[PDB]
Amino acid sequence: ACYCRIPACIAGERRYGTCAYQGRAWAFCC
Amino acid sequence: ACYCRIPACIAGERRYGTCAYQGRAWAFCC
Amino acid sequence: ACYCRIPACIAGERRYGTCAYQGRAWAFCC
Amino acid sequence: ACYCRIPACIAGERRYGTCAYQGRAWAFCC
């Protein structure tokens, strides 16, 4: 699955983009 | 976790954005 | 993490997009 | 599995596209 994470992805996940939601930029991570 | 859905996110989810694939726009729901 | 798979996502993976590589479409699976 | 890397893919991966996050562009590699 994928996640929107603040402030970065977590160990074992990779970043592929950015979620833009509630005035924050979240890492798009899977 | 987040999922692409049509027509809508499911009770309990938040629409964080939009996916695009197979000719369609999808709710991206986390 | 994410794979660009043909023909389908595998096992617990779900689709988030479409990879395109010189005319070939792949499922973006994560 | 696919990843986003600067400045290019690790030799052996194919460049399937471009990622954009954190204000930078990355090779999308699988």
Numbering used by the authors:
A (entry chain B), B (entry chain C), C (entry chain A), D (entry chain D): 1 to 30
What does the primary publication say about this deposited structure?
They are small (2–5 kDa), stabilized structurally by three disulfide bonds, form oligomers, and are divided into α, β and θ structural classes. Further analysis of probable quaternary structures by the Protein Interfaces, Surfaces and Assemblies (PISA) software indicates that the HNP1 dimer forms a tetramer or dimer of dimers in a crystal.
The RMSD between tetramers is 0.744 Å. Unlike wild type HNP1 and most other HNP1 mutants, the tetramer I20A/L25A-HNP1 is not formed as a dimer of dimers. Each monomer contributes equally to tetramer stability with a combined buried surface area of approximately 2760 Å2 (as compared to 2280 Å2 of the wild type HNP1 tetramer). The tetramer is further stabilized by a hydrogen bond between Arg14 and Tyr21 of one pair of subunits. In the present study, we also discovered novel quaternary structures in the crystal, including a form of I20A-HNP1 that appears to be unable to form dimers or tetramers and a novel tetrameric form of I20A/L25A-HNP1. In the virtual colony count assay, whereas the I20A and L25A mutations each made a significant difference against S. aureus, they did not make a significant difference against E. coli or B. cereus even in the I20A/I25A double mutant.
